[PDB]
Design an enzyme around this catalytic site. Structure first.
Site, PDB file in Angstrom:
ATOM      1  N   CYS A 109       0.801  -1.229   0.000  1.00 48.67           N
ATOM      2  CA  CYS A 109       0.000   0.000   0.000  1.00 48.67           C
ATOM      3  C   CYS A 109       0.846   1.296   0.000  1.00 48.67           C
ATOM      4  CB  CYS A 109      -0.954   0.037   1.208  1.00 48.67           C
ATOM      5  SG  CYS A 109      -1.990   1.515   1.230  1.00 48.67           S
ATOM      6  N   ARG A 112      -0.268   4.628   2.755  1.00 48.14           N
ATOM      7  CA  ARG A 112      -0.162   4.467   4.226  1.00 48.14           C
ATOM      8  C   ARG A 112       0.078   5.716   5.068  1.00 48.14           C
ATOM      9  NH1 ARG A 112       3.775  -0.406   4.945  1.00 48.14           N
ATOM     10  NH2 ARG A 112       4.250  -0.067   2.697  1.00 48.14           N
TER      11      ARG A 112
HETATM   12  C1  HEM Z   1      -6.458   6.459   1.568  1.00 51.50           C
HETATM   13  C2  HEM Z   1      -6.242   6.165   0.268  1.00 51.50           C
HETATM   14  C3  HEM Z   1      -5.451   5.003  -0.229  1.00 51.50           C
HETATM   15  C4  HEM Z   1      -4.706   4.928  -1.389  1.00 51.50           C
HETATM   16  C5  HEM Z   1      -4.488   6.051  -2.399  1.00 51.50           C
HETATM   17  C6  HEM Z   1      -4.188   3.587  -1.473  1.00 51.50           C
HETATM   18  C7  HEM Z   1      -3.361   3.139  -2.518  1.00 51.50           C
HETATM   19  C8  HEM Z   1      -3.092   1.795  -2.743  1.00 51.50           C
HETATM   20  C9  HEM Z   1      -2.681   1.269  -3.995  1.00 51.50           C
HETATM   21  C10 HEM Z   1      -2.478   2.070  -5.272  1.00 51.50           C
HETATM   22  C11 HEM Z   1      -2.494  -0.072  -3.834  1.00 51.50           C
HETATM   23  C12 HEM Z   1      -2.063  -1.066  -4.922  1.00 51.50           C
HETATM   24  C13 HEM Z   1      -3.362  -1.545  -5.618  1.00 51.50           C
HETATM   25  C14 HEM Z   1      -3.215  -2.307  -6.933  1.00 51.50           C
HETATM   26  O1  HEM Z   1      -2.177  -2.237  -7.653  1.00 51.50           O
HETATM   27  O2  HEM Z   1      -4.179  -3.029  -7.315  1.00 51.50           O
HETATM   28  C15 HEM Z   1      -2.801  -0.370  -2.469  1.00 51.50           C
HETATM   29  C16 HEM Z   1      -2.677  -1.632  -1.911  1.00 51.50           C
HETATM   30  C17 HEM Z   1      -3.246  -1.889  -0.670  1.00 51.50           C
HETATM   31  N1  HEM Z   1      -3.780  -0.998   0.216  1.00 51.50           N
HETATM   32 FE1  HEM Z   1      -4.084   0.868  -0.040  1.00 51.50          FE
HETATM   33  N2  HEM Z   1      -4.500   2.896  -0.354  1.00 51.50           N
HETATM   34  C18 HEM Z   1      -5.353   3.641   0.385  1.00 51.50           C
HETATM   35  C19 HEM Z   1      -6.027   3.273   1.547  1.00 51.50           C
HETATM   36  C20 HEM Z   1      -6.063   1.956   2.042  1.00 51.50           C
HETATM   37  C21 HEM Z   1      -6.902   1.525   3.103  1.00 51.50           C
HETATM   38  C22 HEM Z   1      -7.959   2.367   3.804  1.00 51.50           C
HETATM   39  C23 HEM Z   1      -6.580   0.192   3.365  1.00 51.50           C
HETATM   40  C24 HEM Z   1      -7.186  -0.719   4.376  1.00 51.50           C
HETATM   41  C25 HEM Z   1      -7.531  -0.348   5.625  1.00 51.50           C
HETATM   42  C26 HEM Z   1      -5.539  -0.167   2.438  1.00 51.50           C
HETATM   43  C27 HEM Z   1      -4.925  -1.386   2.380  1.00 51.50           C
HETATM   44  C28 HEM Z   1      -4.251  -1.780   1.225  1.00 51.50           C
HETATM   45  C29 HEM Z   1      -3.866  -3.195   1.061  1.00 51.50           C
HETATM   46  C30 HEM Z   1      -4.130  -4.345   2.035  1.00 51.50           C
HETATM   47  C31 HEM Z   1      -3.255  -3.272  -0.132  1.00 51.50           C
HETATM   48  C32 HEM Z   1      -2.635  -4.524  -0.741  1.00 51.50           C
HETATM   49  C33 HEM Z   1      -3.489  -5.374  -1.683  1.00 51.50           C
HETATM   50  C34 HEM Z   1      -2.779  -6.655  -2.071  1.00 51.50           C
HETATM   51  O3  HEM Z   1      -1.765  -7.066  -1.451  1.00 51.50           O
HETATM   52  O4  HEM Z   1      -3.233  -7.328  -3.020  1.00 51.50           O
HETATM   53  N3  HEM Z   1      -5.179   0.943   1.709  1.00 51.50           N
HETATM   54  N4  HEM Z   1      -3.106   0.797  -1.774  1.00 51.50           N
END
Ligand code: HEM
Ligand code: HEM
Ligand code: 7LN
Ligand code: 7LN
Ligand code: H4B
Ligand code: H4B
Ligand code: ZN
Lengths: 405, 403
Positions: A109, A112
């Site tokens: 992510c 973060r």
């Molecule tokens: C606040 C705005 C946020 C942005 C801009 C963001 C951005 C991203 C992006 C771009 C990815 C990669 C996604 C992909 O390539 O398909 C990602 C992965 C992830 N984010 Fe976020 N994120 C945000 C909030 C969150 C929130 C609220 C959570 C959970 C509480 C979270 C948990 C994750 C997780 C678990 C992944 C990994 C998915 C995987 O391993 O397949 N993120 N994030």
């Protein structure tokens, strides 16, 4: 030097050491003999108790009451509950802490910096698929907030001995149908062919457009899933236009505002929340580069290049690169016009560098998966490209889990 | 248990069995992955590496188990046992250099691996002689713009003495002059070697694109300065197909990428000076050399000339200027008839190489972070390809700077 991984930034010449990786209890896929970092998919009794103790110690540290009497009493509470029932249950504040920590721990992510700002909806009282639907609608309303998006997670009851799981079958709360054609091609989103066909098998009357919003397939313990259609006024979408290329709007492209991941498992203290959908907002490359330009997704690159009158017959015109840039600009311009939160990949990666510095001081490192953190266009134009990263698994964690069918 | 390797665009799977032939540890452990790190943190040993290499060689010529094979193993053994070292036959050296290139996990250009001109320079005894061999390499490799891959191998390391070394990291490097006010004129990557040249008596220039002399070192002697004759260094002025003001930036790059500070390891023997050259992939120049913030850093200047909105990240001004710069590189190299490959063609050819290597050897070591280009990553097929990174020998390796 220090006996911890040395981490270098090649743009700035600066060095840190990761001491947090020492807290990793869970092995990844790599060995001395070979690096498997690029792989997408990487490969209780007293076992529960040790994970539970570790988590409770983490909770009591975060509120600075470690070693205290309230701390020692909670541990006793947790072991007595496990001793008599085989499982235990989290206090409200422990759930909230654990959910934020799972996000803060997610190596893939880039968003973060936001981790401390998360609305945790406690849905651990839910007892039917119908009620899951109500909870999910409420989440979507809260998180969408007419375009000023707010990070949120809704937590359904944990996995329990014998009893079947709560599961959301769909990978996200909003997904466009993918319809396999006679010629073997796909209308709509090819990523969603399987879930589309499951929805039909379970009684959904399918449409035939490129952007048909799918119904949700929701499963309560030990029951077949039930189908629920989202009210259209709840699903905010953004039609795509380009700021100078007037024909781009004529392409009829669009994307939904709210990215809400629904198929991951939330693990906290050895407890497993098999339905815990979470949402934030989009980074613009997710839509403009991956969703619209992957050859195995909407695959629009050639159509846009043709409209831009580029030479698509040779790689060295850089037709792919120019088209991708304009599609990303259209995404940013259209979300901005529509007043819907979005972040570009420059602003996102800059904020992630700030996050790395915050976490260096707070915890002595930050687990990060370089391949996933570096955006899919313009990689070396962003500061993260030049930053070495150490990848490891910390708990609480979001984890993949097998498909319920 | 061997790694399952997936292509996510095509849905296809292979299994890497070649990784079981790895004898050297990488940086990773089960606790933590260190794959994004750029740099790493007796006679019976030499003998086993020697044998394994001689076995690779005779297997390659399909004479695996012949009397020629057994006799060669006896020669190597007799020489190690008596002297603690041995020497390669020219044909073994040729095979070993090609194998080191084939084995390089960070190289996207390995489709070419069988096509390598090998200059044996092991009869070199002075820096003077090194210079003559280096000039002939440059002349041969450059070939009036029709670039040909080549390697020149100088004498191996020996227990007694200092190493033969080329101090410069490439045979062609632009000077970087550090200002009193901290800033750099020229290539900031070359500040340290620039200062080393001056200190060894070079009269410095004051340009943005001053080609450096070479510092060449024979064993246990101070390095010596040698100016490359200007006619040996082919350069390409940069212009843009449609933007007329671009030529006015006065930008240029050299034709020949020739890496000169890596160690070539073959059968346990180590060649501390073994410069190798091929041709450029266009993003090396257009994206990294020209747009890295710690390199020539020209993105802002170009964006302003394009009248782009520089006030906000969300105008994607950086992305737009970078594309035009990469195009100017491609256009100018094509116009000057100098070999270059764009990142789309190069990555397509690397996919073919992965497939060839699967059939030939059952795998292929590759470093995903280095293979995927620095612009338009997911627009190339390699982004969607899982890759297994590991160290096979023969190999190219980093070594300490000699100062
Ligand atoms: C606040 C705005 C946020 C942005 C801009 C963001 C951005 C991203 C992006 C771009 C990815 C990669 C996604 C992909 O390539 O398909 C990602 C992965 C992830 N984010 Fe976020 N994120 C945000 C909030 C969150 C929130 C609220 C959570 C959970 C509480 C979270 C948990 C994750 C997780 C678990 C992944 C990994 C998915 C995987 O391993 O397949 N993120 N994030
Ligand atoms: C024929 C044309 C070739 C092309 C287009 C090419 C392409 C590349 C590129 C783009 C890189 C990454 C460079 C960087 O990011 O700084 C690279 C790395 C490398 N290539 Fe090549 N290559 C070619 C030929 C060769 C030859 C002839 C050799 C040696 C015989 C070689 C050995 C290497 C090695 C060892 C690396 C890794 C350097 C390191 O780890 O720091 N390649 N190649
Ligand atoms: N799902 C599986 N495999 C699998 C199949 C296809 C793809 C993948 C990889 O998952 C990603 C899809 N390519 C999930 O990406 C969606 C995503 C995830 C996290 C954040 C995302 N973007 C955001 N901006 C946000 C979403 C929520 C908060 S922020 C998007 C995994 C498995 C089944 C059983 C074991 S693994
Ligand atoms: N000096 C060190 N190593 C080091 C220091 C800084 C950076 C690096 C990484 O080296 C790369 C520079 N960023 C080398 O890139 C040059 C290169 C290499 C291989 C192919 C290249 N491009 C081509 N197209 C070709 C060159 C030759 C044939 S094809 C260019 C290495 C060390 C310090 C301590 C122990 S070793
Ligand atoms: C093979 C490779 O790991 C795969 O295509 C990865 C690369 N980096 C990624 N990065 C992000 N953010 N999302 C992804 O889906 C991927 N895909
Ligand atoms: C920290 C990170 O590993 C570093 O910036 C790498 C990334 N990928 C690269 N890829 C290539 N081809 N060349 C490089 O110098 C780098 N640098
Ligand atoms: Zn690794």
């Amino acid at each position: 030097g220090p006996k911890f991984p040395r981490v270098k930034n090649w743009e700035l010449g600066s060095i840190t050491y990761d001491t947090l990786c020492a807290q990793s209890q869970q092995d990844g896929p790599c060995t001395p003999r070979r690096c498997l970092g690029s792989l997408v998919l990487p490969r209780p009794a007293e076992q529960l108790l040790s994970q539970a103790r570790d988590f409770i110690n983490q909770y009591y540290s975060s509120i600075k009451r470690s070693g205290s009497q309230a701390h020692e009493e909670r541990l006793q509470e947790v072991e007595a509950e496990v001793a008599s029932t085989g499982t235990y249950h989290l206090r409200e504040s422990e759930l909230v802490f654990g959910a934020k920590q799972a996000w803060r721990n997610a190596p893939r992510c880039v968003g973060r910096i936001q981790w401390g700002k998360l609305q945790v909806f406690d849905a651990r009282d839910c007892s039917s698929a119908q009620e899951m639907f109500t909870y999910i609608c409420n989440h979507i309303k809260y998180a969408t907030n007419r375009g000023n998006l707010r990070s949120a997670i809704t937590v359904f009851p944990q996995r329990a001995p014998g009893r079947g799981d709560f599961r959301i079958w769909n990978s996200q709360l909003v997904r466009y149908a993918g319809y396999r054609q006679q010629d073997g091609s796909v209308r709509g989103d090819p990523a969603n062919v399987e879930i589309t066909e499951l929805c039909i098998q379970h009684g959904w009357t399918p449409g035939n457009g490129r952007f048909d919003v799918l119904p949700l397939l929701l499963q309560a313990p030990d029951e077949a899933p039930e189908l629920f259609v989202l009210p259209p006024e709840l699903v905010l979408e953004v039609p795509l236009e380009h700021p100078t290329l007037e024909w781009f709007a004529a392409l009829g492209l669009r994307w939904y505002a709210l990215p809400a991941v629904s198929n991951m498992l939330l693990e906290i203290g050895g407890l497993e929340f098999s339905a815990a959908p979470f949402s934030g907002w989009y980074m613009s490359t997710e839509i403009g580069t991956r969703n619209l330009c992957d050859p195995h997704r909407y695959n629009i690159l050639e159509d846009v290049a043709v409209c831009m009158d580029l030479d698509t017959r040779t790689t060295s015109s850089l037709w792919k690169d120019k088209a991708a840039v304009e599609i990303n600009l259209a995404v940013l311009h259209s979300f901005q016009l529509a007043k819907v939160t979005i972040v570009d990949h420059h602003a996102a990666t800059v904020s992630f560098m700030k996050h790395l510095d915050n976490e260096q001081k707070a915890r002595g490192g930050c687990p990060a998966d370089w391949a996933w953190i570096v955006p899919p266009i313009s990689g070396s134009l962003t500061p993260v490209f030049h930053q070495e990263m150490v990848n490891y698994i910390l708990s609480p964690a979001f984890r993949y889990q097998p498909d319920p069918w």
